[PDB]
Design a protein around this nucleic acid. Structure first.
Ligand code: ZN
Ligand code: ZN
Ligand code: ZN
Ligand code: ZN
Ligand code: ZN
Length: 139
DNA sequence: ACGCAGGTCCTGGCAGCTAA
DNA sequence: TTTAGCTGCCAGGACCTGCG
């Protein structure tokens, strides 16, 4: 039987100490000593430390470029192989990169939630508002 | 003559498996 | 058997880039 339940997510636990440890994920969590960012688990903190190091241990066998993560390398490989598995249901365009497909499908919605604070022009992507504000920086 | 969007890789989050 | 650590996989984002 499980008698200790979490308030926010509702998970059950056999002992209260296990509930106290889990509840730190809704609040004392592991924190990076350099940038002071808090992380859910300890393994995620471990992987975050590699961003401070700058090391790239996953090397592409074809071109020789290296990546900070193994899923980045798998994605990169599909570019070499011309594999485009992700396709837009509406416009039919295909992508090797799953984030490129996701970003593309937002355009079919026409939502523009980023508006320029100087001139009021609306943007669908935050990157494009960033560049437009650079133009406003004349002098 | 600049907004638009596609290319490319970096970051962090969980589910599920697996080693301690 | 329990549990912590590990991996795959994924959503989101930043930065560059040429096109119309
Ligand atoms: Zn909870
Ligand atoms: Zn840090
Ligand atoms: Zn390559
Ligand atoms: Zn489309
Ligand atoms: Zn503006």
């Amino acid at each position: 039987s499980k008698s200790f339940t979490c308030d926010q997510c509702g998970k059950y636990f056999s002992q209260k100490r296990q509930l106290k440890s889990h509840y730190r994920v809704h609040t004392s969590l592991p924190e990076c000593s350099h940038c002071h960012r808090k992380f859910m688990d300890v393994s995620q903190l471990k992987k975050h430390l590699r961003t401070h190091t700058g090391e790239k241990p996953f090397t592409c066998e074809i071109c020789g470029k290296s990546f900070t993560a193994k899923s980045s390398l798998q994605t990169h490989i599909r570019i070499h192989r011309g594999e485009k598995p992700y396709s837009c249901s509406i416009c039919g365009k295909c992508f090797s990169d799953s984030s490129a497909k996701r970003r593309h499908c937002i355009l079919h919605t026409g939502k523009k939630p980023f508006s320029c604070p100087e001139c009021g022009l609306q943007f669908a992507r935050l990157d494009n508002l960033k560049a437009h504000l650079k133009i406003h920086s004349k002098e």
